[PDB]
Symmetry: C3
Subunit: 92 residues, 3 copies
């Protein structure tokens, strides 16, 4: 997957970066586990899109709403990543 390697890249980079920076163990944990929250959610979204692909041919509100919601969940996870990193790095 193309974009899963885009966020894969974003996640591994974010992790490595969060490790190079000397930071409180708790805070390294928070950064890492935040970006990993994003990771897990994305894999779940992959699973959903897999099931939506398995069943049905046509567009439905029922069928599109699902994938749309998955994408939304991913977006929320990333918002959490952004905000978490923001507040923690601001705390300094």
């Amino acid at each position: 997957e193309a974009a899963f390697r885009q966020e894969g890249v974003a996640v591994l980079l974010a992790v490595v970066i969060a490790c190079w920076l000397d930071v409180d163990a708790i805070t390294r944990v928070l950064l890492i586990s935040s970006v990993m929250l994003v990771m897990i959610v994305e894999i779940l979204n992959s699973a959903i899109e897999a099931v939506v692909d398995r069943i049905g041919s046509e567009y439905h509100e029922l069928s599109g709403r699902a994938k749309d919601m998955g994408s939304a969940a991913v977006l929320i996870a990333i918002i959490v990543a952004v905000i978490t990193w923001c507040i923690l790095l601001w705390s300094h």
Copy 2:
């Protein structure tokens, strides 16, 4: 390259708002979540703890959206097939419940620590 990102954002918006309008059980949690966040922001506390209360709340949020996705799928199957197990929606609901339990407990312990 950058177009894909904005398309994803768009789908995210249409799906988040689909989640909002097509469900009235997602708004109780919406209110509870935004309120919990705001409240967690006007109280004085260390940044790490802000991060924690808020992220517990948002864990609940994300899980809820996923549950919405599952129920959409089951709606799709229930259209095609005739009988529904209903074991999927139940477990989604269970996941949400666990997330909220985490919220409650997290807030409990943190607020006990500080106060």
Copy 3:
């Protein structure tokens, strides 16, 4: 308020379902309750107790979601050959990532404290 108590009932039946139907759910259950109790035995910074437990419960929630996905795949591929075993595989992968997070979190935190 009953519109909430019905949801609680559904959570309970769906959890007795997740528990009993999956003969494997119980394992991660043991690991998680043990991890929680142990993390409560240890005298730690409230924040850190919260984090340990949060990692563990993250694993829990992800696991339940995976059970949900598995149920869906069951209803579908009852008699049908599937190009969607990858769905369940992704689920299992998500669980694995959650547990990796648990392991790493506990590692770093206990290293810090000790």
